[PDB]
Design a protein around this ligand. Structure first.
Ligand code: NI
Ligand code: NI
Ligand code: NI
Ligand code: NI
Ligand SMILES: [O]
Ligand SMILES: [O]
Lengths: 563, 122, 100, 563, 100, 100
């Protein structure tokens, strides 16, 4: 007996060779392989397979290889591949990617993916499943920002802030032991993973280091606190000893040095370069040259992403506003660098996306703009050379890496989060293809759903209107502790800061981020000579001129959004 | 050129289910006065007692239909079905308590079936 | 008024539908959420009028047509469901494929 | 001096012989007796009775027979009677039903119902007071469902789920030790009483039993997990050893057996039969015959309640939707059984109501539909034989029992909740007669108000618009722990699960539910031979044909609801 | 805008009143919450107009009559109260027995 | 509909603008929040229409004039900002000194 492909895909989701459109873009992903055994697919409901003595094992206790949760028939889009598999979760972690069910009667069942009495089922047939997004440029300014981030598929916020204080409104900084303590305690109430950056500023070691010891997960050097050679040097000395990441927003004014002076202060050490294009801040006009260096982990913030007809006007708008806050604003907003930034993303020269949430970037549009950028580059440059089968798999993997694995690697947290791999924490986002990258269906945090687009709570079923994003049981009562991770420095963990503050959240250790570089950025590992003409702002890559133009319209926009 | 958001473009061809496993066609009658649906993965010998068929031919087998679908028998209805072989370890536990071990234990299964009045045993 | 949770939430649907209808009246092709809001509010006002579930299941297929909405929106909307208080209590209306 | 009855009732609420209309139905309840001493009624305000040295005792410390809370002049509607009394609460429990005040100067004061310095007052004159509703068919799918349930007078949710996972969306199941642990911790944040059911599925004891030991309060057998003879048998063996209830949704497909096979697997053991009519699931077409057996505790879910002109169309709707989820849907939705279900409720043959919240039933309409059903039966059948004085007291007690005491008894929690009796937890709902069964005035949880229809928080007084349901102080901070009960199995309590998980809520013990049957269902204790014709679906009770028709309009509907 | 909590809540009353007025305009007898919304919003818009508390206490008895509402609704509504910002600050309006 | 948090919040701005426009239509000089709501909703509907950021920056200075608002309101409003979905994605509009 055979099933034609069309019916197969509409019952179990697509299989090898089938392609799926991402939202309303022209990007197509193709299933590269499938872990299933045809005819033994798992599924759940009346007269279906996951029933006792059939696809559900009736014998084994929870320890006997039995899952807490099976996502059935998921189409995984990840740096590691685009493929079809069941995903098994246990103790809040991904334990198995393969084929789930009952070895009593089914062939090809991954040994630790038994569906037993202890197993919950999520049907992912017809969905795309990705890792949760990792946003490493967050300003903690307004708690309402968390649901905004969840609704667009973000599960980890790294950054700084104490709320709408001017320091926090300008910089991703929680300054000093006491502010850090207060925000670690606040974090207890936020249904998302968090890591907090201290102020990367000082001319002695101790004022800086004491923030790492208090529980910071990294540091932020920002021009508004003095992005001087001294603060750069001291912060990187601290980071090399504490094994945490430093993010930099460099001296736009070129007051104490030009870009070459900042690189000299860095002295070959690892650093994450924020909003590398420079509209968001940094050495005018040439900061973007950072992205060519092997010791630099380069991210974009999202408002320049990608380059559109309104981009400049709105940034000129944004500069007026800065003048009105009277911020030394009589160069800064450059079509040449914003255009080039599109192409650098496509070439794998800028490795990461991030938001810049509420300071100069949009908490809920990291994932959204990543795909708009990929789609614009396909429209303008065409399929990448590396593609085949007519799919966009290569570009899809390069782009998905920018907001999942690469931020995780740069931050020192990729052992926990950032990709759908065995052994990693079960932060997972389900997407209907029609909404992919726009509005997440269900956000799983530590193996429990935390957030979902779901309907009327008084109704006979959950689908009647109004369907909107809502916090689910993972966020309620004490379960918020078990489903979310506070990331902290090794020294604060060793010194017992969690117990000293009463933290009940899972504690993640930041590590292995001093011993990495550009080469470690998955699919985005290009080092090169970037030249930015001081007079014309013309961008060259290894002597070749980079040029693009803005587009009038984007997908993943007015078809979807009520405002 | 018309864009259907999230649409599939499936590859050409067909998927064969349960490839390489023996198949067997048998006749089955619903002798009861109420409808019976049978799912793709229930060990076929352990279905509702009122289904009359050669119970021996149900051992170690299940319906050869797409995973998660069901055959339907109206009251009084007799029809053919195609069976495929169970895979994995070829063991069954629970369901109707006829097997609780290897499906190789044919005489034990049929003795339990007959004693409890599952129609169509020798 | 004694508003219960659903009554408070459902005010939003009526509001989104008013917004969408103003947008349609000034000549815009409607998007996915606008279209959903319009058809949903039509159903709830229908039930308030005392129509039957059967009537609203038919009428709901003729509230917006493809020329009223952006490309792809008809195919994005497979069903629209709404619960409302009919003269005989709360019932569920599902409108399958409301826009062709 | 005498007060005519009209003025008496408008100052103190009605007294013996007076009748009150329930909302806009044609049901009248009559005060059967009154605990008061005429002229010594308690009341609170300027120049009123509960003042120091007068109706308030100025001498006694809180331990000396003094109440924490007196509800004055309540009209109680309960299985135990419809009568007038003051209700006294202390340490979060009902300690006295009688006559409250000061024995210094008042006659007839119940000895442990002194109003003293420690006493808070709620005026219940002119209100109806009932026990909180006990909903034993809850799917935990969206946390927004809790306020929906509170607004319609429900105070205990028994059921299962991990949020909008397909397992939970189909079945009242929290599967396995880890899911159960996570949801017990979530429960810490939900302002309502909760008990959690594990998966009643397995062919070995241990995979099932380990869920009871982890903290489940009962089990759910559901066809979608395999409602086979084995899973039925193993679950009831577990339940008989652990002293918890099993709920069943049987094999609609008749795949492994017909109804007689399910009864044989049950083997005379106690079981709660969910949605016994069968639209909600179960042996097609004859499941409803379950309700005649002495070992079966039968409930209805609410969408078939009661039978109306739109009922079938909407259920046909609901079946289309199931086909579109592609659930083996090419018999199921039967006017004959839905009609009969009306009459079985009226006859005391179906003992309980429940919602089926968000899976095929409405979280906030258990109480609402109970009264709509009673009202329809009075309109069609007329007063029951047992009535007198022209009141509907007998029917009112049979119906109030369906959502208060009977679910409590079936679940093994009636020592704590389910009725207004001395010694029980102070879960109480105040209703204005005009809103009775539609929108609760104030919901009391453990002696503190948890939820209330109340107005503008910025106003000089609490009654200005907009008046809506809102969470009150009982739900805020740590008070949520003290006002709500997590019900758990004796073994999980004995094994220290509350301390092991950090639960701070009051822990209720599930017990005495293996040693009960149909006869224990208050006012609803009828056993009989129910016949369901296999060809015509005609329903007979002891050889007599049951026949009813749907109504075009219901009370407690468009007069009240904004949508 | 600087909306405070009451300003945000009270937008709902205006919205419910718009909904109710559309229902009345298409010929429906109004229910309990619709009637309350209409009279309440009338009061708040009245105060915004600069009328006095005394004026709104009188006028509020003549916004809806029994023939505008379902059976029993006049007797369900004993009072309607609303606070709003008058030219001289927030004041409370109570309209006793608004519908006969 | 799949409303996200901002979509739900922004319905409020449209609603406040409808309320304010009714107040203006019956002859009232508008206050600080009413004025902000009107100009903000104008911007968001403008972006929905497909206008550019530059157009809305100009037009926003001419939606209300001093004679439309109470004394002091022009000087209380230094800027009005709104983000909305343009055909090319979300952008920020700032209107400086919208009322003279
Ligand atoms: Ni910056
Ligand atoms: Ni920033
Ligand atoms: Ni069920
Ligand atoms: Ni259910
Ligand atoms: O930034
Ligand atoms: O159910």
């Amino acid at each position: 007996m055979k099933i034609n492909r069309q019916q197969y895909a509409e019952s179990y989701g697509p299989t090898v060779g089938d392609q799926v459109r991402l939202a309303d873009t022209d990007l197509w992903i193709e299933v590269e392989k499938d872990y299933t055994t045809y005819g033994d697919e798992a599924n759940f409901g009346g007269g279906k397979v996951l029933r006792e003595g059939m696809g559900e094992n009736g014998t084994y206790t929870r320890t006997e290889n039995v899952l807490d949760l099976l996502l059935t028939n998921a189409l995984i889009l990840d740096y590691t591949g685009i493929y079809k598999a069941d995903i098994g979760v246990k103790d809040g972690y991904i334990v198995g990617i393969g084929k789930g069910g009952n070895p009593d009667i089914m062939d090809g069942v991954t040994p630790n993916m038994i569906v037993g009495t202890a197993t919950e089922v999520i049907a992912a047939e017809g969905k795309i499943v990705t890792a949760g997004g990792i946003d490493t440029h967050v300003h903690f300014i307004n708690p309402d920002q968390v649901d905004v981030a969840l609704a667009n598929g973000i599960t980890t916020l790294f950054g700084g802030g104490t709320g709408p204080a001017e320091g926090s409104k300008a910089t991703t900084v929680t300054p000093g032991p006491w502010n850090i303590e207060k925000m670690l305690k606040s974090t207890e109430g936020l249904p998302i993973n968090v890591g907090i950056l201290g102020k990367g500023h000082g001319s002695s070691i101790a004022p800086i280091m004491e923030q790492i010891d208090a529980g910071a997960a990294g540091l932020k050097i920002h021009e508004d606190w003095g992005a001087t050679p001294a603060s750069i040097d001291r912060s990187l000395t601290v980071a090399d000893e504490a094994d945490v990441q430093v993010a930099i927003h460099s001296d736009t004014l070129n007051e104490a040095g030009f870009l070459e002076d900042t690189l000299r202060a860095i002295n070959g050490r690892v650093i994450h370069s924020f909003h590398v294009e420079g509209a968001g801040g940094g050495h005018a006009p040439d900061i973007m040259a950072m992205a060519g260096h092997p010791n630099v982990l380069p991210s974009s913030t999202n408002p320049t992403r990608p380059f559109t007809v309104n981009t400049i006007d709105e940034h000129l708008d944004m500069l007026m506003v800065c003048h009105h806050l009277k911020q030394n604003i009589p160069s800064r907003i450059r079509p040449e660098t914003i255009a080039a930034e599109d192409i650098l993303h496509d070439l794998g020269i800028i490795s990461m996306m991030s938001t810049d949430a509420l300071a100069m970037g949009r908490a809920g549009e990291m994932v959204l703009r990543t795909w708009q950028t990929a789609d614009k580059m396909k429209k303008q440059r065409g399929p990448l050379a590396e593609e085949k089968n007519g799919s966009d798999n290569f570009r899809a993997k390069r782009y998905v890496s920018k907001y999942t694995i690469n931020p995780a690697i740069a931050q020192g947290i990729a052992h926990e989060v950032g990709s759908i791999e065995e052994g990693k924490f079960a932060d997972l986002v389900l997407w209907e293809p029609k909404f992919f990258g726009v509005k997440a269906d269900r956000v799983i945090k530590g193996g429990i759903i935390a957030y979902a687009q779901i309907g009327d709570p008084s109704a006979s079923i959950p689908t009647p209107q109004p369907v909107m994003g809502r916090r689910m049981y993972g966020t309620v009562g004490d379960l918020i502790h078990d489903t979310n991770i506070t990331f902290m420095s090794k020294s604060s963990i060793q010194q017992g800061v969690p117990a000293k503050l009463g933290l009940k959240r899972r504690i993640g250790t930041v590590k292995n981020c001093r011993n990495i570089g550009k080469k470690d950025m998955k699919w985005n590992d290009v080092t090169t000579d970037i030249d930015i003409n001081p007079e014309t702002y013309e961008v060259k890559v290894d002597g070749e001129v980079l040029t693009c133009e803005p587009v009038k319209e984007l997908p993943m926009a007015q078809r979807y959004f009520l405002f | 050129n018309y864009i259907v958001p999230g649409e599939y473009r499936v590859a050409e061809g067909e998927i064969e289910i349960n490839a390489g496993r023996e198949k067997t066609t048998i006749r089955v009658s619903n002798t009861g006065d109420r409808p019976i649906q049978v799912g793709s993965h229930i060990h076929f010998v352990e279905v509702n007692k009122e289904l009359l068929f050669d119970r021996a031919e149900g051992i170690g087998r299940r319906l050869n239909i797409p995973s998660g679908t069901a055959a339907r028998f109206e009251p009084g209805e007799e029809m053919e079905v195609e069976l495929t072989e169970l895979g994995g370890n070829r063991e069954v536990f629970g369901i109707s308590d006829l097997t609780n071990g290897s499906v190789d234990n044919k005489e034990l299964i049929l003795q339990r079936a007959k004693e409890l009045g599952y129609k169509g045993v020798e | 008024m004694h508003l219960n949770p659903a009554e408070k939430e459902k005010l939003q649907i009526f509001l989104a539908s008013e917004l969408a209808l103003k947008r349609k009246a000034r000549g815009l092709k409607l998007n996915y959420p606008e279209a959903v809001a319009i058809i949903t509010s039509f159903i709830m006002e229908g039930a308030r009028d005392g129509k039957t579930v059967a009537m609203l299941m038919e009428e709901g297929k003729h509230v917006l047509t493809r020329d009223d909405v952006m490309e792809g929106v008809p195919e994005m909307i497979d069903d629209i469901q709404a619960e409302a208080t009919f003269p005989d209590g709360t019932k569920l209306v599902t409108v399958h494929n409301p826009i062709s």
